Design a protein around this ligand. Structure first.
Ligand SMILES: *Cc1c(COP(=O)(O)O)cnc(C)c1O
Ligand SMILES: *Cc1c(COP(=O)(O)O)cnc(C)c1O
Ligand SMILES: O=C(O)CCc1ccccc1
Lengths: 394, 388
């Protein structure tokens, strides 16, 4: 029977990897990585996280089945981290998931469960995995303009014009912050206008909050999400702990369902629990327990925020340096967007030809859409990348 | 939108878990003399070693780690493990393995039907219903003898067609405790090859029946006979890491080409559902399995659990014998595994819990691991008073 199976395409993160490894050049650089790496090219385990694991190893006495939709400590801590004081426990349903991707997949299953004729609007461009999951589910996908290739900023007028076509019951996927892959983000004022269009259309917003803490700060990064949450009755939020907690492989995510009333909340919470049951019964415990422990233990929460802040500031300085280098070389402020972008990613706006030419002549690797990871940069690699960009005529 | 969500039916077994001189005999979790589900010695040592050795938590393998895949393949199939034709996928527990098994099969056969034992783990049917798969049932439990109705099973299975899937419990049949002998297994292999039905084996209690190797005997027999077979394994109960969510799906194929196809489709399945599988439990398992000292202590502890439960069954049988003045309840000593169904009707079961404080699943399924010297005679007497 298994012979009838249609061949499925590989990730692609590995094809780029195999090519990079095969390159015999001593000065080759990899800006295609999708995770944070420090100065030494390593992805460390955050201090507070290692502290939580030592703590868990000494206090945990059992590993019996726990909470179906997650542990209360985790659900509450995550809700407070994302929504702050605006958290309305009475109308908020929460579900621990297998990473942010699991939260996204579940959000989609939940929405389709409530609205079979669901259509989803995604940004142009967006995290490729969004479309993949949606295509796999058979969901109708619609695109809304977002990245302005020329200014490398947000084409807001276009975004607004396209979103205006959304009908009641449709879902609009928004990146809460640090837009992957572009790095171009909405201002709080633009968020406010988006809220108006959403109220008008009656479209359900799904916020992908995977980088809270890498933009302008923990609270700052959740600002857009909190505005949407307070002005829109029903809101779906799929959060990730992979990057901001540095526990990628542990698979710790969270799905928040903001409902108009408690009756609906019980309905949503029950359906979410049912969704976990029919997929894998219970969600992973380890990562979630690390998170709730860090968040509930003052000493740890403190050290964690301090390490995240150091990380954010470090990347922000890398941006400033690159932008300055490019300013000095270009004799213009065209590349200023690099210092305006937020997150660990940025789309340079180079064409595939320019991308290939950069690799061949300078040994610098990056995603085919010209997306680079700022964390993979440093004092020694910045001058090289800058010169490369100018030389290939970007 | 969300206001249109219809209410869902709760999990009956896990419902009692919430409801609980109370005596918990419900959820299939191993418990010790003091009513505690402990962390196995080797598992604890493994976690301690992991804390010292892990330097990063970056994304790892989409299909799981090679170490985990290999160790698990060896634990299950032993020397019958043909890597060139075996695709392995780390999953979110055994339940995740089952779901992923059904998705893989449906992709290869949009019109597949699934044959399940009468009765079977309720969660088997709930998932199939959710997915919208046609479910047929085959006779298995003999309510009279409390054993297996093998004649009925053979009859019903012979009616299966190629492309269909037959779900079998590798050992320690949940919820009955009634198991097939190796001769009956060989007989089943004949039917499977004659009909061309794809076997899906749920292996959740390897080590709780007659032993690690012995509990895999039937699975190894089907794997050597049938060219294509799926195995959904759980590390929740035999490693005592229930909440970690670790298990794996093994896809045995006739050739390397099909193996490549299956492997790719399985990786794709994880990617579209939750991206990467959880690392913590899988790492604990491979660490135990690949470290001689740890594997040895683990096998010893698992054997102790096994022997202990077996002792309990005999105690319960004896106690009941004295009180009933008969041996009707003899079946309790012959059943193998964590569970055993008595026979008490729904009303009797309910009366028992509402006054005696002893909770057992509605179909009279009891977790023998929940008993001990003190509670056994109490239970025995309680069933006598509830009569029939
Ligand atoms: C990382 C990421 C996710 C989810 O990460 P998980 O590893 O599944 O926790 C979701 N959306 C975006 C945009 C991301 O960058
Ligand atoms: C335990 C069990 C499983 C798997 O449970 P997980 O906690 O998901 O590992 C599957 N089937 C049966 C019959 C079981 O008893
Ligand atoms: O009690 C059981 O049958 C095994 C434990 C279990 C029950 C329901 C969902 C997952 C695991």
């Amino acid at each position: 029977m298994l012979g009838n199976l249609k061949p499925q395409a590989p990730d692609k993160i590995l094809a780029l990897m195999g090519e990079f490894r095969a390159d015999p050049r001593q000065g080759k650089i990899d800006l295609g990585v999708g995770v944070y790496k420090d100065a030494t090219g390593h992805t460390p385990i955050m201090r507070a996280v290692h502290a939580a694991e030592q703590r868990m190893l000494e206090t945990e006495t059992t590993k019996t089945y726990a909470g179906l939709s997650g542990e209360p400590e985790f659900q509450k801590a995550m809700g407070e981290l994302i929504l702050g004081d605006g958290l309305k426990s009475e109308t908020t349903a929460t579900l621990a998931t297998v990473g942010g991707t699991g939260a996204l997949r579940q959000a989609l299953e939940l929405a389709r469960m409530a609205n079979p004729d669901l259509r989803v609007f995604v940004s142009d461009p967006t995290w490729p995995n969004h479309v993949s999951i949606m295509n796999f589910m058979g969901l109708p996908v619609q695109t809304y303009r977002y990245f302005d290739a020329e200014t490398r900023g947000v084409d807001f007028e276009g975004m607004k014009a396209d979103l205006a076509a959304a009908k009641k019951g449709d879902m609009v996927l928004l990146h809460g912050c640090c837009h992957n892959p572009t790095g171009a983000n909405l201002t709080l004022d633009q968020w406010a206008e988006i809220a108006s269009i959403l109220e008008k259309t009656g479209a359900l917003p799904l916020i992908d909050l995977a980088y809270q803490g890498f933009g302008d700060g923990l609270e700052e990064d959740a600002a857009g999400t909190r505005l949407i949450a307070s002005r829109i009755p029903e809101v779906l939020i799929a959060a990730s702990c992979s990057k901001n907690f540095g526990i990628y492989r542990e698979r710790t995510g969270c799905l928040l369902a903001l409902c108009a009333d408690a009756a609906t909340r019980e309905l949503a919470q029950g359906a979410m629990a049912f969704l976990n049951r029919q997929t894998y019964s219970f969600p992973p415990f380890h990562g979630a327990k690390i998170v709730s422990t860090v968040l509930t233990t003052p000493e740890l929460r403190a050290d964690w925020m301090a390490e995240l802040e150091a990380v954010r500031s470090g990347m922000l300085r890398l941006r400033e340096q690159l932008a300055g280098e490019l300013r000095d070389l270009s004799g213009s402020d065209r590349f200023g967007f690099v210092a305006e972008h937020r997150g660990m990613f940025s789309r340079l706006g180079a064409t595939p030809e320019q991308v290939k030419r950069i690799k061949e002549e300078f040994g610098i690797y990056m995603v085919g859409d010209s997306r680079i990871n700022i964390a993979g940069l440093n004092d020694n690699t910045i001058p090289i990348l800058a010169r490369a960009i100018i030389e290939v005529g970007v």
